[PDB]
Structure 1
Amino acid sequence: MNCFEMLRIDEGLRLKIYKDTEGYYTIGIGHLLTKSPSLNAAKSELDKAIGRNCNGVITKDEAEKLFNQDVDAAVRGILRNAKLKPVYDSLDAVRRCALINMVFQMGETGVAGFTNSLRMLQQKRWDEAAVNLAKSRWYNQTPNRAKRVITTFRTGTWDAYKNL
Structure 2
Amino acid sequence: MNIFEMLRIDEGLRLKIYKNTEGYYTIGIGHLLTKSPSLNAAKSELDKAIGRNTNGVITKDEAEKLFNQDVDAAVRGILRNAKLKPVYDSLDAVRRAALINMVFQMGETGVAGFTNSLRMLQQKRWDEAAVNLAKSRWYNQTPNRAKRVITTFRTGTWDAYGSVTVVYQNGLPVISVRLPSRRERCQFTLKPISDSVGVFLRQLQEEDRGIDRVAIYSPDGVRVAASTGIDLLLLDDFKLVINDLTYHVRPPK
State the alpha-carbon separation in 2 of the partners of residues 127 and 2 from structure 1. Answer: 22
- Aligned CA distance change for structure 1 residues 122 and 9 (closer, same or farther; 3 Å): same
- Aligned CA distance change for structure 1 residues 141 and 46 (closer, same or farther; 3 Å): closer
Deviates more, 1:20-29 or 1:95-104: 20-29
Contact 2:74 2:107 survives alignment (8 Å): no
> What 5-or-longer segments of structure 1 have no aligned partner?
none
- Aligned CA distance change for structure 1 residues 2 and 15 (closer, same or farther; 3 Å): farther
Contact 1:4 1:64 survives alignment (8 Å): no
Q: Deviations over 1:15-46 (max 9, x none)?
A: 56768899999653134799999999999999
- Aligned CA distance change for structure 1 residues 142 and 48 (closer, same or farther; 3 Å): closer
State the alpha-carbon separation in 2 of the partners of residues 129 and 42 from structure 1. Answer: 35
Superposition RMSD in Å: 3.8
Match of 1:37 in 2: 37
Contact 2:19 2:25 survives alignment (8 Å): yes
- Aligned CA distance change for structure 1 residues 79 and 48 (closer, same or farther; 3 Å): same
Contact 1:25 1:35 survives alignment (8 Å): yes
Identify the structure with the greater helix proportion.
Answer: 1
Q: Deviations over 1:19-77 (max 9, x none)?
A: 88999996531347999999999999999999999999877677445422221122112
Contact 2:70 2:104 survives alignment (8 Å): no
State the alpha-carbon separation in 2 of the partners of residues 81 and 56 from structure 1. Answer: 33
- Aligned CA distance change for structure 1 residues 135 and 57 (closer, same or farther; 3 Å): closer
Q: Compute the TM-score of the two structures, normalised by the length of structure 2.
A: 0.48
State the alpha-carbon separation in 2 of the partners of residues 38 and 137 from structure 1. Answer: 24
- Aligned CA distance change for structure 1 residues 33 and 109 (closer, same or farther; 3 Å): closer
Q: Compute the TM-score of the two structures, normalised by the length of structure 1.
A: 0.70
- Aligned CA distance change for structure 1 residues 52 and 154 (closer, same or farther; 3 Å): same
Q: Which has the larger radius of gyration?
A: 2
> What 5-or-longer segments of structure 2 have no aligned partner?
161-253
Contact 2:133 2:139 survives alignment (8 Å): yes
What fraction of aligned residue pairs are identical, expressed as a percent? 98
